[PDB]
Amino acid sequence: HAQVDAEQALAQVNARIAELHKMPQAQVPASEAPKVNYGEEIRKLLDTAFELRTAIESIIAGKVPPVDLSTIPARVDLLTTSVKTIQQANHNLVNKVEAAHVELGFSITRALIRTINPTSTAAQLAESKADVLSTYAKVAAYRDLKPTDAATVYVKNRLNTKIWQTRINRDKYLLGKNAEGYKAINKALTHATGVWFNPATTVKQVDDEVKALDLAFQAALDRR
């Protein structure tokens, strides 16, 4: 094919939905979302994605489109951009001051409203897409945190995300098998939770606790 048709758009949306589902943040309860990294962004991406999937299969089935059909590829693309920018920020913006994640998050948030807004024009969609990518490039040049700084919300939420990730992985591998690995990771989780609750935890102390959690999951795995 040449142009992106509905079925390709759909398939892109479904690929984003599957990517989002693999993220730990996507599997925490709604009440935890504010306490993991981009947790609320990741829920809004899923909601937007489900919205777009419904409209697109509504279109494939031959009903009336809730949005201009010609904007569909741009809507999906703005989703795809928002997903990939969230994924990037997740990996690359770890040490940034809080303003980075706040500014990025707000940009993602505006874009997702535009993505589903039936009144969003092509120009408006492209504006949104450019704001997301540009915002990311800006905030990526923000100042880092020193290892010695007190851990900020983002940083604390990074530990909680790793804690959550470990819990999930624990419940999928070490459980009902590696009975003594389960106990080793639960000790690690217990200790990680403590660092997470302590209000004097420093940035370096979160970076190490995160290192400590995945080392111990692997270690538990290694020993069967």
Looking at residue 160, which CATH number applies to its domain?
1.20.1270
Task: Report d(CA 213, CA 185) in Å as an integer.
Answer: 8
User: Are 73 and 110 found together in one domain?
Assistant: yes
Task: Report d(CA 154, CA 158) in Å as an integer.
Answer: 6
Task: Report d(CA 71, CA 73) in Å as an integer.
Answer: 6
Q: Where are the alpha helices (DSSP H) in 26-178?
A: 39-60, 72-92, 98-116, 122-139, 153-169
Where b means 16+ CB within 10 Å and e means fewer, 50-79 reads ebbbebbeebeeeeeeebeeebbbbbbbbb
User: Are 58 and 115 found together in one domain?
Assistant: yes
User: Are 29 and 105 found together in one domain?
Assistant: yes
User: Are 134 and 87 found together in one domain?
Assistant: yes
126 occurs within a structural domain: yes
Experimental method: X-ray
**Both structure tokens of 207:** 């970076």
User: Are 178 and 216 found together in one domain?
Assistant: yes
Whether the Cβ atoms of residue 132 and residue 85 lie closer than 8 Å to each other: yes
Q: Which residues are bridge partners to 150 per DSSP?
A: 202
Q: DSSP letter for 96, please.
A: B
Q: DSSP letter for 118, please.
A: T
Task: Report d(CA 109, CA 56) in Å as an integer.
Answer: 21
Q: What are phi and psi of 150, to 5 degrees?
A: -65, 140
User: Are 49 and 97 found together in one domain?
Assistant: yes
- How far from 152 is each of 139, 145, 204, CA to CA, in Å? 16, 9, 11
| Number of domains, the chain | 2
Q: Which residues are bridge partners to 202 per DSSP?
A: 150
The domain in which residue 157 lies consists of 153-222
User: Are 121 and 209 found together in one domain?
Assistant: no
